[PDB]
């Protein structure tokens, strides 16, 4: 029926999210300006956007109940592996099926397939990413479920390099049970039909998107002219 602890967890995550995801997107003005013509014209802007987003995901992760109990090394492994996935997940909030784009408050900060494809990454990444956004949007998750999914994504014991996988697993299960119980007690059918299973599938979809993003990143890292336009944080998190 959702223990006091589980309600506690959900409250913590909702707050953590509100403190790390600003729906006014007021900080986007600090990013190097977007350029829509477009040979890699969107790379500078989106590089800053992603770098900024990485910082926000780290802020969120640190507030996840139990994350603080992990070692510095394990925290780093988890963030490095989940960053792009959580970024793709949190972005579902600005994504709109009306015109298949991420509407971040204004024309200049509204990104579609043509914009997102001007940063060195191909449709081999973008097409599946857009499909993912649609599938996730169609789940019509409660914000409670959205934040739980992001936290579950971050605290994954099977990430390469994890040391105390047992501690990680325990922390994740606590989150996974909170999710399974919230769906049962707070998400009325039919919208709840196999919802947990579908949410877990999205975690699988994100692994695939992550793998493809990594593949293309490596390729691009072989070209200094592009790597030159990224940020130090991106270079560090994604590989240098």
């Amino acid at each position: 029926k959702l223990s006091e602890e589980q309600q506690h967890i959900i409250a913590i995550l909702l707050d953590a999210h509100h403190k790390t995801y600003d729906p006014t997107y007021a900080d986007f003005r600090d990013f190097r300006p977007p350029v829509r013509m477009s040979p890699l014209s969107m790379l500078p802007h989106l590089a800053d956007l992603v770098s900024y987003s990485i910082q926000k995901v780290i802020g969120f992760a640190k507030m996840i109940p139990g994350f603080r109990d992990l070692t510095s090394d394990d925290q780093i492994v988890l963030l490095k592996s989940s960053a792009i996935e959580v970024i793709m997940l949190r972005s579902n909030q600005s994504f709109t099926m009306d015109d298949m784009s991420w509407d971040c408050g204004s024309q200049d900060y509204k990104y579609d397939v043509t914009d997102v494809s001007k940063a060195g990454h191909t449709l081999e990444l973008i097409e599946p990413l857009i499909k993912f956004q649609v599938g996730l949007k169609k789940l019509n998750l409660h914000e409670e479920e959205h934040v739980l999914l992001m936290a579950i994504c971050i605290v994954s014991p099977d990430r390469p390099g994890v040391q105390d996988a047992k501690l990680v697993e325990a922390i994740q299960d606590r989150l996974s049970n909170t999710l399974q119980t919230y769906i049962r007690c707070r998400h009325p059918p039919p919208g709840s039909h196999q919802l947990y299973a579908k949410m877990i599938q999205k975690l699988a979809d994100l692994r695939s998107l992550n793998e493809e993003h990594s593949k293309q990143y490596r390729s691009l890292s072989f070209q200094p002219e592009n790597s030159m336009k990224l940020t130090p944080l991106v270079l560090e998190v994604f590989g240098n």
């Binding site: 780290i58 780093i76 963030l79």
Partner: peptide, 11 residues
């Protein structure tokens, strides 16, 4: 693999 900025943001 020594992640200075990440480590700093986590602490």
């Amino acid at each position: 693999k020594n992640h200075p900025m990440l480590m700093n943001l986590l602490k």
